[PDB]
């Protein structure tokens, strides 16, 4: 604060507002995050461990600046979000060489944060940021565990549940790293088909739309399950789909891939690490967006 003007809004995430400001001093644009609340310290302790965990495909945390109930994260400007993009893309989808380079580019992101035992807990199309040279970014990274995950944003605008692991929403309080690869996997689906996969609209309608598609969950797909806190055994029992039909036109070594990603039991779930070693990356370019910004 003081030394940014405020540019243009970009952005309302959960925890706050995000302008386009610029430095006073140095120049530079930023995206500037005004989160909402004096301030925890503990929020305070983890948000500036986040100063540390830099990588070319994680959004560049610039400075933490705390002053009075206020917290203002300025991070590094990217000109656009893949939903953007996605909407902008939608009458031909975006090439898959493109999406097959972003989703090589966010697991090398994710394995990153993963190797350090950072979890982001909620990607999403909206906190994936691109630029004109073909890289895309993750954003929020460390940002829910620093603060909460709200059921509504500062704005009162819903948080979505598309995207939340099945572990999530059956009451898991300690899930893991594989919480990021199910979301990720989602965001490929959605990428390839134009469409989201499982757009929830409550908890339970989340979690129907992921069963009417994967299969009701049981003990043999995933031990533990139904043990959950929020697992009823009166949940209906769907058959699980074949990826042929949920995401067409995908080659093989993509369904492969993403029916590793989606699976139930987290502890089978593909890591990032390996997910960069699956034969669909064998041939992975880098290619430019074409961006009309
Ligand atoms: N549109 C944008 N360009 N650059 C950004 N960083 C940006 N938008 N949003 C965010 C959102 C959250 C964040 O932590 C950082 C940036």
Redesign the pocket.
């Known amino acids: 604060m003081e030394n940014f003007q405020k540019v243009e809004k970009?952005?309302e995430?959960t925890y706050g507002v995000?302008y386009?400001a610029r430095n006073k001093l140095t120049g530079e644009v930023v995206?500037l995050?005004k989160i909402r609340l004096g301030v925890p310290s503990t929020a305070i302790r983890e948000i500036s461990l986040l100063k540390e965990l830099n990588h070319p495909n994680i959004?560049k945390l610039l400075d933490v600046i705390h002053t009075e109930n206020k917290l203002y994260?300025v991070?590094?400007?990217?000109?656009?979000?893949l939903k953007k993009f996605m909407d902008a893309s939608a009458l031909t989808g975006i090439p898959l060489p493109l999406i097959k380079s972003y989703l090589f580019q966010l697991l090398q992101g994710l394995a990153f944060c993963h190797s350090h035992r950072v979890l982001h807990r909620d990607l999403k199309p909206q906190?994936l940021?691109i630029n004109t040279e073909g890289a895309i970014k993750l954003?929020?990274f460390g940002?829910a565990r620093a603060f909460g995950v709200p059921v509504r944003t500062y704005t009162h605008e819903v948080v979505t549940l598309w995207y939340r692991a099945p572990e999530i929403l059956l009451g898991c309080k300690y899930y893991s790293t594989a919480v990021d690869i199910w979301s990720l996997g989602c965001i490929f689906a959605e990428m390839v088909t134009r469409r989201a996969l499982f757009p929830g609209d409550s908890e339970i309608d989340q979690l129907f739309r992921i069963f009417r598609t994967l299969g009701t969950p049981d003990e043999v797909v995933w031990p533990g399950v139904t043990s959950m806190p929020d697992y009823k055994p009166s949940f209906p029992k769907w058959a699980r789909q074949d990826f042929s039909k949920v995401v067409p036109p995908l080659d093989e070594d993509g369904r492969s891939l993403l029916s590793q990603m989606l699976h139930y039991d987290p502890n089978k779930r593909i890591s990032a690490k390996a997910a960069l070693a699956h034969p669909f990356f064998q041939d992975v370019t880098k290619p430019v967006p074409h961006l009309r910004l």
């Open positions: 970009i952005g995430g995000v386009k995206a995050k959004v994260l991070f590094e400007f990217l000109h656009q979000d906190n940021l954003a929020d940002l």
